[PDB]
Protein backbone atom coordinates (compact mmCIF):
# COMPACT_ATOMS: atom_id res chain seq x y z
CA UNK A 1 0.00 0.00 0.00
CA UNK A 2 1.17 3.51 -0.89
CA UNK A 3 -0.11 6.64 0.88
CA UNK A 4 0.64 9.78 -1.13
CA UNK A 5 -0.35 13.45 -0.94
CA UNK A 6 -0.48 16.03 -3.73
CA UNK A 7 -0.79 19.82 -4.02
CA UNK A 8 0.54 20.74 -0.57
CA UNK A 9 1.58 24.31 0.25
CA UNK A 10 4.16 25.44 2.78
CA UNK A 11 1.60 27.88 4.23
CA UNK A 12 -0.98 25.24 5.10
CA UNK A 13 -2.69 26.51 8.25
CA UNK A 14 -0.98 29.89 8.62
CA UNK A 15 -2.93 33.12 9.08
CA UNK A 16 -0.74 36.12 8.27
CA UNK A 17 -0.95 39.24 10.41
CA UNK A 18 1.02 41.03 7.68
CA UNK A 19 3.25 40.23 4.70
CA UNK A 20 6.84 40.55 5.90
CA UNK A 21 8.31 40.36 2.39
CA UNK A 22 6.00 43.14 1.19
CA UNK A 23 6.83 45.19 4.28
CA UNK A 24 10.57 44.82 3.68
CA UNK A 25 10.19 45.70 -0.01
CA UNK A 26 7.95 48.72 0.66
CA UNK A 27 9.78 50.06 3.73
CA UNK A 28 11.01 53.67 3.45
CA UNK A 29 13.22 54.33 6.46
CA UNK A 30 10.91 52.29 8.69
CA UNK A 31 11.96 49.65 11.23
CA UNK A 32 12.32 47.16 8.35
CA UNK A 33 15.21 49.09 6.77
CA UNK A 34 17.61 46.80 8.64
CA UNK A 35 16.54 43.85 6.45
CA UNK A 36 16.91 45.68 3.12
CA UNK A 37 20.66 44.87 2.78
CA UNK A 38 19.89 41.15 3.24
CA UNK A 39 19.91 39.39 -0.13
CA UNK A 40 18.35 35.96 0.49
CA UNK A 41 15.54 37.26 2.69
CA UNK A 42 12.53 35.95 0.75
CA UNK A 43 13.87 32.38 0.69
CA UNK A 44 14.50 32.47 4.44
CA UNK A 45 11.08 33.94 5.20
CA UNK A 46 9.32 31.41 2.96
CA UNK A 47 10.50 28.26 4.74
CA UNK A 48 11.86 29.60 8.02
CA UNK A 49 8.88 28.50 10.13
CA UNK A 50 9.20 24.80 9.28
CA UNK A 51 7.30 22.48 6.95
CA UNK A 52 4.34 20.38 8.05
CA UNK A 53 4.16 17.95 5.10
CA UNK A 54 7.26 17.43 2.97
CA UNK A 55 7.50 16.43 -0.68
CA UNK A 56 10.39 15.11 -2.74
CA UNK A 57 12.61 17.90 -4.09
CA UNK A 58 14.92 17.38 -7.05
CA UNK A 59 18.55 18.47 -6.87
CA UNK A 60 19.30 21.99 -8.07
CA UNK A 61 22.24 21.14 -10.35
CA UNK A 62 20.83 17.85 -11.67
CA UNK A 63 17.07 17.39 -11.86
CA UNK A 64 17.21 13.57 -11.91
CA UNK A 65 18.74 13.23 -8.44
CA UNK A 66 16.54 13.72 -5.37
CA UNK A 67 17.52 15.52 -2.18
CA UNK A 68 17.98 13.45 0.97
CA UNK A 69 17.48 14.06 4.69
CA UNK A 70 20.61 14.16 6.81
CA UNK A 71 19.34 14.48 10.37
CA UNK A 72 16.62 12.84 12.46
CA UNK A 73 15.85 14.00 16.01
CA UNK A 74 13.42 12.33 18.44
CA UNK A 75 11.81 14.58 21.05
CA UNK A 76 11.06 13.16 24.50
CA UNK A 77 9.15 14.58 27.46
CA UNK A 78 8.36 13.46 31.01
CA UNK A 79 5.46 14.82 33.07
CA UNK A 80 4.37 14.46 36.69
CA UNK A 81 1.52 15.76 38.73
CA UNK A 82 2.27 18.21 41.56
CA UNK A 83 -0.87 17.25 43.52
CA UNK A 84 0.28 13.67 44.22
CA UNK A 85 1.29 14.67 47.77
CA UNK A 86 -2.40 14.91 48.74
CA UNK A 87 -3.12 11.23 48.04
CA UNK A 88 -3.69 8.55 50.67
CA UNK A 89 -2.91 4.84 50.79
CA UNK A 90 -4.57 1.97 48.94
CA UNK A 91 -7.81 0.08 49.52
CA UNK A 92 -7.35 -3.55 48.43
CA UNK A 93 -10.75 -4.79 49.66
CA UNK A 94 -14.12 -3.12 50.06
CA UNK A 95 -15.81 -0.28 48.23
CA UNK A 96 -17.16 2.29 50.71
CA UNK A 97 -15.54 4.58 53.29
CA UNK A 98 -17.56 5.87 56.25
CA UNK A 99 -16.74 9.13 58.05
CA UNK A 100 -18.28 10.05 61.42
CA UNK A 101 -18.26 13.32 63.39
CA UNK A 102 -19.78 14.13 66.79
CA UNK A 103 -20.69 17.77 67.41
CA UNK A 104 -21.20 19.74 70.63
CA UNK A 105 -24.28 20.09 72.85
CA UNK A 106 -25.90 23.00 74.67
CA UNK A 107 -25.85 24.13 78.29
CA UNK A 108 -28.98 23.75 80.42
CA UNK A 109 -30.00 26.12 83.21
CA UNK A 110 -29.63 24.65 86.69
CA UNK A 111 -32.89 23.69 88.40
CA UNK A 112 -33.95 21.22 91.12
CA UNK A 113 -37.75 21.50 91.06
CA UNK A 114 -37.65 20.57 87.38
CA UNK A 115 -34.88 18.01 87.91
CA UNK A 116 -36.95 16.06 90.44
CA UNK A 117 -39.18 14.73 87.63
CA UNK A 118 -36.78 14.20 84.69
CA UNK A 119 -33.83 12.32 86.18
CA UNK A 120 -34.01 9.56 83.55
CA UNK A 121 -34.66 11.87 80.60
CA UNK A 122 -32.30 11.27 77.68
CA UNK A 123 -30.66 13.71 75.27
CA UNK A 124 -29.73 12.53 71.78
CA UNK A 125 -26.08 13.25 70.87
CA UNK A 126 -25.47 15.20 67.67
CA UNK A 127 -23.53 13.12 65.14
CA UNK A 128 -23.23 13.12 61.34
CA UNK A 129 -21.85 10.64 58.81
CA UNK A 130 -21.00 10.60 55.13
CA UNK A 131 -19.84 7.98 52.65
CA UNK A 132 -17.27 7.79 49.85
CA UNK A 133 -17.23 5.28 46.98
CA UNK A 134 -14.99 4.15 44.15
CA UNK A 135 -15.82 6.15 41.04
CA UNK A 136 -12.94 5.87 38.53
CA UNK A 137 -12.24 2.76 36.42
CA UNK A 138 -10.26 3.41 33.24
CA UNK A 139 -7.57 2.01 30.99
CA UNK A 140 -5.09 3.29 28.42
CA UNK A 141 -4.74 1.23 25.23
CA UNK A 142 -2.00 1.35 22.61
CA UNK A 143 -0.61 -0.86 19.85
CA UNK A 144 2.88 -1.43 18.47
CA UNK A 145 3.24 -2.66 14.87
CA UNK A 146 7.02 -3.01 14.79
CA UNK A 147 7.33 -4.91 11.50
CA UNK A 148 5.32 -2.23 9.70
CA UNK A 149 7.26 0.46 11.59
CA UNK A 150 10.67 -0.81 10.41
CA UNK A 151 10.39 0.95 7.02
CA UNK A 152 10.28 4.45 8.57
CA UNK A 153 13.85 4.34 9.91
CA UNK A 154 17.37 3.56 8.73
CA UNK A 155 18.90 3.32 12.22
CA UNK A 156 18.18 0.75 14.92
CA UNK A 157 18.93 3.37 17.56
CA UNK A 158 16.24 5.68 16.19
CA UNK A 159 13.81 2.75 15.89
CA UNK A 160 14.34 1.75 19.53
CA UNK A 161 14.12 5.37 20.71
CA UNK A 162 10.79 5.81 18.92
CA UNK A 163 9.43 2.60 20.46
CA UNK A 164 10.54 3.77 23.92
CA UNK A 165 8.80 7.11 23.38
CA UNK A 166 5.60 5.27 22.44
CA UNK A 167 5.87 3.34 25.70
CA UNK A 168 6.52 6.49 27.76
CA UNK A 169 3.43 8.20 26.31
CA UNK A 170 1.21 5.86 28.36
CA UNK A 171 2.66 6.95 31.71
CA UNK A 172 2.62 10.60 30.63
CA UNK A 173 -1.09 10.25 29.84
CA UNK A 174 -1.76 8.57 33.19
CA UNK A 175 -0.03 11.35 35.15
CA UNK A 176 -1.80 14.10 33.20
CA UNK A 177 -5.21 12.49 33.69
CA UNK A 178 -4.61 12.04 37.42
CA UNK A 179 -3.74 15.73 37.77
CA UNK A 180 -6.83 16.74 35.79
CA UNK A 181 -9.07 14.54 37.96
CA UNK A 182 -7.69 16.14 41.12
CA UNK A 183 -8.30 19.62 39.70
CA UNK A 184 -11.81 18.58 38.64
CA UNK A 185 -12.50 17.65 42.26
CA UNK A 186 -11.95 21.26 43.38
CA UNK A 187 -13.83 22.72 40.40
CA UNK A 188 -16.80 20.43 41.09
CA UNK A 189 -16.78 21.38 44.77
CA UNK A 190 -16.91 25.06 43.83
CA UNK A 191 -19.60 24.46 41.20
CA UNK A 192 -21.83 22.75 43.77
CA UNK A 193 -21.61 25.80 46.05
CA UNK A 194 -20.03 23.92 48.95
CA UNK A 195 -17.17 26.38 49.52
CA UNK A 196 -17.25 29.43 51.75
CA UNK A 197 -16.61 32.37 49.44
CA UNK A 198 -14.48 35.33 50.54
CA UNK A 199 -14.23 38.31 48.20
CA UNK A 200 -10.73 39.68 47.64
CA UNK A 201 -11.51 42.40 45.08
CA UNK A 202 -13.70 44.95 46.88
CA UNK A 203 -11.61 47.26 49.10
CA UNK A 204 -12.54 48.90 52.39
CA UNK A 205 -10.76 52.18 51.59
CA UNK A 206 -9.84 54.08 48.43
CA UNK A 207 -6.36 54.96 49.73
CA UNK A 208 -4.20 52.68 47.60
CA UNK A 209 -5.64 49.31 48.63
CA UNK A 210 -3.17 47.10 46.78
CA UNK A 211 -2.77 44.90 49.89
CA UNK A 212 -6.47 44.11 50.35
CA UNK A 213 -6.21 40.54 49.05
CA UNK A 214 -3.21 39.64 51.21
CA UNK A 215 -4.81 41.26 54.27
CA UNK A 216 -8.02 39.27 53.71
CA UNK A 217 -6.10 36.02 53.21
CA UNK A 218 -4.06 36.61 56.37
CA UNK A 219 -7.16 37.38 58.43
CA UNK A 220 -9.02 34.34 57.09
CA UNK A 221 -6.07 32.05 57.81
CA UNK A 222 -5.75 33.48 61.33
CA UNK A 223 -9.44 33.00 62.14
CA UNK A 224 -9.46 29.50 60.63
CA UNK A 225 -7.27 28.35 63.55
CA UNK A 226 -8.87 30.03 66.56
CA UNK A 227 -8.62 27.64 69.54
CA UNK A 228 -12.34 27.78 70.37
CA UNK A 229 -13.25 26.77 66.81
CA UNK A 230 -16.00 27.89 64.46
CA UNK A 231 -18.73 26.45 62.26
CA UNK A 232 -18.60 29.04 59.46
CA UNK A 233 -15.93 27.42 57.27
CA UNK A 234 -17.19 23.89 56.53
CA UNK A 235 -20.16 22.72 54.48
CA UNK A 236 -21.50 20.46 57.25
CA UNK A 237 -21.92 23.43 59.65
CA UNK A 238 -19.99 21.67 62.43
CA UNK A 239 -17.96 23.55 65.05
CA UNK A 240 -14.43 22.38 64.24
CA UNK A 241 -10.83 23.55 64.54
CA UNK A 242 -7.88 23.84 62.15
CA UNK A 243 -4.12 24.09 62.63
CA UNK A 244 -1.74 26.46 60.89
CA UNK A 245 0.73 23.74 59.87
CA UNK A 246 -2.11 21.70 58.29
CA UNK A 247 -3.46 24.45 56.00
CA UNK A 248 -2.75 24.33 52.27
CA UNK A 249 -3.23 27.35 49.99
CA UNK A 250 -3.45 26.53 46.27
CA UNK A 251 -3.05 29.74 44.27
CA UNK A 252 -2.42 30.94 40.72
CA UNK A 253 0.81 31.97 39.02
CA UNK A 254 -0.47 35.47 38.25
CA UNK A 255 -1.59 35.95 41.86
CA UNK A 256 1.82 34.80 43.12
CA UNK A 257 3.58 37.20 40.75
CA UNK A 258 1.24 40.03 41.77
CA UNK A 259 2.00 39.51 45.45
CA UNK A 260 5.73 39.17 44.82
CA UNK A 261 6.06 42.32 42.73
CA UNK A 262 3.60 44.42 44.74
CA UNK A 263 4.27 43.77 48.45
CA UNK A 264 7.43 41.66 48.80
CA UNK A 265 9.64 43.90 46.65
CA UNK A 266 8.76 46.97 48.75
CA UNK A 267 8.08 45.58 52.25
CA UNK A 268 10.66 45.77 55.03
CA UNK A 269 10.88 42.50 56.97
CA UNK A 270 8.53 40.76 54.51
CA UNK A 271 7.78 38.06 57.12
CA UNK A 272 4.94 40.32 58.34
CA UNK A 273 3.24 40.41 54.92
CA UNK A 274 3.65 36.92 53.39
CA UNK A 275 1.13 34.08 53.17
CA UNK A 276 0.38 31.84 56.15
CA UNK A 277 -0.41 28.37 54.76
CA UNK A 278 1.65 25.95 52.69
CA UNK A 279 1.65 27.53 49.23
CA UNK A 280 1.15 25.45 46.07
CA UNK A 281 0.99 27.13 42.66
CA UNK A 282 -1.00 25.78 39.69
CA UNK A 283 -2.07 27.03 36.26
CA UNK A 284 -5.41 28.51 37.30
CA UNK A 285 -8.84 26.98 37.79
CA UNK A 286 -11.72 26.36 35.39
CA UNK A 287 -14.44 28.37 37.14
CA UNK A 288 -14.61 32.12 36.60
CA UNK A 289 -14.37 33.35 40.18
CA UNK A 290 -11.71 31.08 41.66
CA UNK A 291 -8.31 32.65 42.28
CA UNK A 292 -7.17 30.74 45.37
CA UNK A 293 -8.39 27.92 47.60
CA UNK A 294 -7.41 27.33 51.24
CA UNK A 295 -8.14 23.83 52.56
CA UNK A 296 -7.18 21.42 55.33
CA UNK A 297 -4.94 18.39 54.94
CA UNK A 298 -7.91 16.11 55.68
CA UNK A 299 -10.05 17.73 52.96
CA UNK A 300 -8.78 15.33 50.29
CA UNK A 301 -10.11 11.75 50.36
CA UNK A 302 -8.34 10.27 47.33
CA UNK A 303 -7.39 6.59 47.26
CA UNK A 304 -6.17 4.20 44.56
CA UNK A 305 -7.64 0.70 44.25
CA UNK A 306 -5.88 -0.77 41.21
CA UNK A 307 -2.83 -0.14 39.00
CA UNK A 308 -1.72 -2.77 36.51
CA UNK A 309 -0.52 -3.37 32.95
CA UNK A 310 -1.12 -6.30 30.61
CA UNK A 311 -0.05 -7.10 27.05
CA UNK A 312 -1.28 -9.39 24.28
CA UNK A 313 0.30 -10.28 20.94
CA UNK A 314 -1.65 -10.71 17.71
CA UNK A 315 0.37 -13.13 15.51
CA UNK A 316 -1.87 -12.97 12.45
CA UNK A 317 -1.59 -9.18 12.32
CA UNK A 318 1.93 -9.17 13.78
CA UNK A 319 1.50 -6.58 16.51
CA UNK A 320 1.36 -5.95 20.26
CA UNK A 321 -1.43 -4.49 22.42
CA UNK A 322 -0.76 -2.76 25.75
CA UNK A 323 -3.50 -2.08 28.31
CA UNK A 324 -2.90 -0.02 31.46
CA UNK A 325 -5.73 -0.26 34.00
CA UNK A 326 -6.18 2.34 36.75
CA UNK A 327 -8.96 2.18 39.35
CA UNK A 328 -9.31 4.98 41.90
CA UNK A 329 -11.74 6.69 44.26
CA UNK A 330 -11.79 10.49 44.27
CA UNK A 331 -13.76 12.40 46.90
CA UNK A 332 -13.50 15.21 49.44
CA UNK A 333 -14.50 15.52 53.09
CA UNK A 334 -17.18 18.04 54.04
CA UNK A 335 -16.09 18.02 57.70
CA UNK A 336 -12.85 19.92 56.95
CA UNK A 337 -12.43 23.67 56.59
CA UNK A 338 -12.38 24.95 53.01
CA UNK A 339 -12.54 28.55 51.78
CA UNK A 340 -12.42 29.96 48.24
CA UNK A 341 -11.19 33.46 47.37
CA UNK A 342 -13.25 35.14 44.64
CA UNK A 343 -12.43 38.26 42.59
CA UNK A 344 -15.72 38.88 40.78
CA UNK A 345 -19.41 38.96 41.61
CA UNK A 346 -21.28 36.31 43.58
CA UNK A 347 -24.88 35.62 44.60
CA UNK A 348 -26.14 36.83 47.96
CA UNK A 349 -26.56 33.31 49.37
CA UNK A 350 -24.47 30.33 48.27
CA UNK A 351 -26.11 27.50 50.23
CA UNK A 352 -28.42 26.59 53.11
CA UNK A 353 -27.50 23.75 55.48
CA UNK A 354 -30.09 21.97 57.62
CA UNK A 355 -28.22 20.54 60.60
CA UNK A 356 -30.33 17.36 61.04
CA UNK A 357 -30.28 15.96 57.52
CA UNK A 358 -31.48 12.42 58.31
CA UNK A 359 -34.16 11.78 60.93
CA UNK A 360 -36.46 9.00 62.14
CA UNK A 361 -39.53 9.98 64.16
CA UNK A 362 -42.58 8.16 65.47
CA UNK A 363 -46.23 8.88 64.65
CA UNK A 364 -46.64 11.14 67.69
CA UNK A 365 -43.14 12.57 67.97
CA UNK A 366 -41.51 15.85 67.02
CA UNK A 367 -38.20 16.99 65.55
CA UNK A 368 -36.32 20.29 65.78
CA UNK A 369 -34.27 21.51 62.81
CA UNK A 370 -31.76 24.35 62.60
CA UNK A 371 -30.71 26.18 59.44
CA UNK A 372 -27.43 27.89 58.51
CA UNK A 373 -27.39 30.21 55.50
CA UNK A 374 -24.05 31.03 53.85
CA UNK A 375 -24.50 34.68 52.90
CA UNK A 376 -21.59 36.35 51.12
CA UNK A 377 -22.70 39.84 52.19
CA UNK A 378 -23.68 41.17 55.62
CA UNK A 379 -27.41 41.30 54.80
CA UNK A 380 -29.52 38.91 56.87
CA UNK A 381 -32.09 36.72 55.10
CA UNK A 382 -34.92 34.73 56.65
CA UNK A 383 -35.67 31.08 55.93
CA UNK A 384 -39.14 29.63 55.39
CA UNK A 385 -39.90 26.00 56.24
CA UNK A 386 -42.11 23.50 54.44
CA UNK A 387 -42.90 19.78 54.49
CA UNK A 388 -43.69 17.73 51.37
CA UNK A 389 -44.93 14.63 53.18
CA UNK A 390 -48.54 14.82 52.04
CA UNK A 391 -50.62 13.55 54.95
CA UNK A 392 -52.94 15.95 56.76
CA UNK A 393 -51.84 16.59 60.35
CA UNK A 394 -48.07 16.82 59.90
CA UNK A 395 -46.92 20.42 60.16
CA UNK A 396 -43.78 22.48 60.73
CA UNK A 397 -43.69 25.79 62.60
CA UNK A 398 -41.80 28.91 61.56
CA UNK A 399 -39.00 28.19 64.03
CA UNK A 400 -38.34 24.72 62.61
CA UNK A 401 -40.29 22.34 64.84
CA UNK A 402 -41.97 19.48 62.96
CA UNK A 403 -44.90 17.51 64.39
CA UNK A 404 -46.20 14.31 62.79
CA UNK A 405 -49.83 13.16 62.74
CA UNK A 406 -50.74 9.95 64.54
CA UNK A 407 -51.87 8.31 61.28
CA UNK A 408 -49.17 8.66 58.62
CA UNK A 409 -46.74 6.34 56.82
CA UNK A 410 -44.51 7.89 54.13
CA UNK A 411 -41.08 9.46 53.76
CA UNK A 412 -41.18 13.13 54.76
CA UNK A 413 -39.12 15.84 53.05
CA UNK A 414 -38.32 18.96 55.09
CA UNK A 415 -37.27 22.03 53.11
CA UNK A 416 -35.91 25.41 54.20
CA UNK A 417 -35.87 28.00 51.42
CA UNK A 418 -34.42 31.51 51.15
CA UNK A 419 -35.40 34.02 48.45
CA UNK A 420 -32.64 36.20 46.99
CA UNK A 421 -34.24 37.32 43.71
CA UNK A 422 -36.56 40.21 42.98
CA UNK A 423 -40.34 40.23 42.66
CA UNK A 424 -41.74 38.34 39.65
CA UNK A 425 -38.22 36.93 39.16
CA UNK A 426 -37.72 34.63 42.16
CA UNK A 427 -34.41 32.95 42.95
CA UNK A 428 -34.37 30.32 45.70
CA UNK A 429 -31.68 28.62 47.76
CA UNK A 430 -32.94 25.46 49.45
CA UNK A 431 -31.70 23.14 52.17
CA UNK A 432 -33.31 19.73 52.53
CA UNK A 433 -33.66 16.87 55.01
CA UNK A 434 -35.27 13.43 54.95
CA UNK A 435 -37.41 11.94 57.73
CA UNK A 436 -38.52 8.32 58.15
CA UNK A 437 -41.54 7.18 60.17
CA UNK A 438 -41.39 4.43 62.78
CA UNK A 439 -44.49 2.21 63.18
CA UNK B 1 -37.18 -2.55 64.47
CA UNK B 2 -36.21 -1.77 60.87
CA UNK B 3 -35.56 1.80 59.70
CA UNK B 4 -35.08 2.14 55.94
CA UNK B 5 -34.98 4.92 53.35
CA UNK B 6 -36.26 4.64 49.78
CA UNK B 7 -35.75 6.82 46.69
CA UNK B 8 -33.21 9.28 48.09
CA UNK B 9 -31.40 11.55 45.64
CA UNK B 10 -27.62 11.97 45.60
CA UNK B 11 -28.09 15.78 45.52
CA UNK B 12 -30.21 16.14 48.65
CA UNK B 13 -29.31 19.62 49.87
CA UNK B 14 -27.13 20.90 47.03
CA UNK B 15 -27.91 23.98 44.94
CA UNK B 16 -25.43 24.41 42.09
CA UNK B 17 -24.21 27.72 40.71
CA UNK B 18 -23.71 26.01 37.35
CA UNK B 19 -23.86 22.47 35.97
CA UNK B 20 -20.26 21.23 35.87
CA UNK B 21 -21.10 18.25 33.65
CA UNK B 22 -23.00 20.46 31.20
CA UNK B 23 -20.13 22.97 31.15
CA UNK B 24 -17.66 20.18 30.40
CA UNK B 25 -19.89 18.70 27.69
CA UNK B 26 -20.71 21.97 25.89
CA UNK B 27 -17.16 23.35 25.87
CA UNK B 28 -15.38 24.86 22.84
CA UNK B 29 -12.09 26.51 23.75
CA UNK B 30 -13.18 27.17 27.33
CA UNK B 31 -11.22 26.31 30.48
CA UNK B 32 -12.86 22.85 30.57
CA UNK B 33 -11.00 21.68 27.45
CA UNK B 34 -8.62 19.82 29.76
CA UNK B 35 -11.60 18.10 31.40
CA UNK B 36 -13.09 17.12 28.02
CA UNK B 37 -10.79 14.09 27.39
CA UNK B 38 -11.54 12.64 30.85
CA UNK B 39 -13.50 9.41 30.50
CA UNK B 40 -15.17 8.81 33.89
CA UNK B 41 -15.80 12.48 34.64
CA UNK B 42 -19.57 12.13 35.14
CA UNK B 43 -19.25 9.65 38.01
CA UNK B 44 -16.57 11.74 39.73
CA UNK B 45 -18.70 14.86 39.42
CA UNK B 46 -21.76 12.98 40.70
CA UNK B 47 -20.25 11.40 43.83
CA UNK B 48 -17.16 13.54 44.40
CA UNK B 49 -18.54 15.61 47.29
CA UNK B 50 -19.63 12.66 49.43
CA UNK C 1 -4.42 34.80 16.21
CA UNK C 2 -4.67 31.25 14.84
CA UNK C 3 -6.53 27.94 14.92
CA UNK C 4 -4.60 24.65 15.08
CA UNK C 5 -6.10 21.33 13.99
CA UNK C 6 -4.40 18.62 16.05
CA UNK C 7 -4.33 15.99 13.27
CA UNK C 8 -2.91 17.88 10.30
CA UNK C 9 -2.22 14.80 8.15
CA UNK C 10 -4.58 11.82 8.03
CA UNK C 11 -5.20 8.72 5.93
CA UNK C 12 -8.59 6.99 6.02
CA UNK C 13 -10.35 4.30 4.03
CA UNK C 14 -13.62 4.63 2.11
CA UNK C 15 -15.71 3.54 5.10
CA UNK C 16 -13.55 4.86 7.91
CA UNK C 17 -13.90 7.84 10.22
CA UNK C 18 -11.53 10.39 11.73
CA UNK C 19 -11.62 12.71 14.74
CA UNK C 20 -10.17 16.22 14.75
CA UNK C 21 -9.75 18.74 17.57
CA UNK C 22 -9.29 22.49 17.20
CA UNK C 23 -7.23 24.74 19.48
CA UNK C 24 -8.00 28.46 19.18
CA UNK C 25 -5.34 30.96 20.25
CA UNK C 26 -7.48 33.71 21.80
CA UNK C 27 -5.75 36.79 23.19
CA UNK C 28 -8.72 37.80 25.36
CA UNK C 29 -10.77 35.73 27.80
CA UNK C 30 -13.81 35.58 25.51
CA UNK C 31 -15.08 32.30 24.06
CA UNK C 32 -15.50 31.62 20.34
CA UNK C 33 -17.31 28.88 18.43
CA UNK C 34 -15.59 26.70 15.83
CA UNK C 35 -17.43 25.57 12.70
CA UNK C 36 -16.21 22.64 10.59
CA UNK C 37 -16.36 22.00 6.85
CA UNK C 38 -14.95 19.67 4.20
CA UNK C 39 -13.87 20.85 0.74
CA UNK C 40 -13.25 17.44 -0.83
CA UNK C 41 -16.24 17.83 -3.14
CA UNK C 42 -17.75 14.34 -2.85
CA UNK C 43 -21.32 13.50 -1.86
CA UNK C 44 -21.82 11.37 1.23
CA UNK C 45 -18.73 12.74 3.00
CA UNK C 46 -19.67 14.70 6.10
CA UNK C 47 -18.28 16.31 9.24
CA UNK C 48 -20.17 16.78 12.50
CA UNK C 49 -20.11 19.78 14.82
CA UNK C 50 -17.93 17.85 17.27
CA UNK D 1 -11.19 57.81 63.87
CA UNK D 2 -11.11 54.21 62.60
CA UNK D 3 -8.36 51.56 62.52
CA UNK D 4 -9.21 50.75 58.87
CA UNK D 5 -10.38 54.11 57.48
CA UNK D 6 -6.92 54.99 56.13
CA UNK D 7 -3.22 54.47 56.79
CA UNK D 8 -2.92 57.68 58.82
CA UNK D 9 -5.73 56.83 61.21
CA UNK D 10 -4.01 53.53 62.03
CA UNK D 11 -0.75 55.24 62.97
CA UNK D 12 -2.64 57.88 64.96
CA UNK D 13 -4.34 55.06 66.88
CA UNK D 14 -0.93 53.48 67.47
CA UNK D 15 0.35 56.82 68.81
CA UNK D 16 -2.62 57.17 71.16
CA UNK D 17 -2.26 53.59 72.41
CA UNK D 18 1.47 54.05 73.07
CA UNK D 19 0.89 57.32 74.93
CA UNK D 20 -1.87 55.77 77.06
CA UNK D 21 0.30 52.74 77.85
CA UNK D 22 3.21 54.99 78.83
CA UNK D 23 1.09 57.16 81.12
CA UNK D 24 -0.67 54.18 82.73
CA UNK D 25 2.63 53.04 84.30
CA UNK D 26 4.13 56.25 85.69
CA UNK D 27 5.61 55.57 89.15
CA UNK D 28 3.70 58.42 90.81
CA UNK D 29 0.34 56.87 89.86
CA UNK D 30 -2.87 58.39 88.55
CA UNK D 31 -6.58 58.31 89.44
CA UNK D 32 -7.64 58.76 85.81
CA UNK D 33 -8.13 55.26 84.36
CA UNK D 34 -10.26 53.37 86.90
CA UNK D 35 -13.96 53.40 87.71
CA UNK D 36 -13.31 54.08 91.41
CA UNK D 37 -11.10 57.13 90.68
CA UNK D 38 -8.44 55.84 93.09
CA UNK D 39 -4.75 56.61 92.63
CA UNK D 40 -3.11 53.43 91.34
CA UNK D 41 -0.13 52.32 89.27
CA UNK D 42 0.15 49.56 86.66
CA UNK D 43 3.09 47.73 85.09
CA UNK D 44 3.98 47.19 81.45
CA UNK D 45 4.39 43.43 81.89
CA UNK D 46 0.84 43.21 83.28
CA UNK D 47 -0.85 45.29 80.58
CA UNK D 48 -2.92 43.28 78.10
CA UNK D 49 -4.38 44.57 74.83
UniProtKB/Swiss-Prot annotation, chain B:
Homohexamer. Homopentamer. The prolate capsid is composed of pentamers and hexamers of the capsid protein. Assembles to form a prolate capsid shell of about 54 nm in length and 45 nm in width, with a T=3, Q=5 symmetry. It is found in: Virion. The chain holds residues 1 to 50 of 448 of the full protein. The lineage of its organism: Viruses, Duplodnaviria, Heunggongvirae, Uroviricota, Caudoviricetes. This is Major capsid protein. Belongs to the phi29likevirus major capsid protein family. It comes from Bacillus phage phi29 (Bacteriophage phi-29).
UniProtKB/Swiss-Prot annotation, chain C:
Residues 1-50 form the BIG2 domain. It is found in: Virion. Belongs to the phi29likevirus major capsid protein family. Homohexamer. Homopentamer. The prolate capsid is composed of pentamers and hexamers of the capsid protein. Assembles to form a prolate capsid shell of about 54 nm in length and 45 nm in width, with a T=3, Q=5 symmetry. This is Major capsid protein. It comes from Bacillus phage phi29 (Bacteriophage phi-29). The lineage of its organism: Viruses, Duplodnaviria, Heunggongvirae, Uroviricota, Caudoviricetes.
Amino acid sequence: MRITFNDVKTSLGITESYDIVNAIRNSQGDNFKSYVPLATANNVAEVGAGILINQTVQNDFITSLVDRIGLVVIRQVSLNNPLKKFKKGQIPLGRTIEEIYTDITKEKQYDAEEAEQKVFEREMPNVKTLFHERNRQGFYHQTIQDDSLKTAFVSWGNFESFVSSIINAIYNSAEVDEYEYMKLLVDNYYSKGLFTTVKIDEPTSSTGALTEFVKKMRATARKLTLPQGSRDWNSMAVRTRSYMEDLHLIIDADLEAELDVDVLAKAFNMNRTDFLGNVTVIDGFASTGLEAVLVDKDWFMVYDNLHKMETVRNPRGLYWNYYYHVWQTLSVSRFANAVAFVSGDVPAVTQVIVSPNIAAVKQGGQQQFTAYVRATNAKDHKVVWSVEGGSTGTAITGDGLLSVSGNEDNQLTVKATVDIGTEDKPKLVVGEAVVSIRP
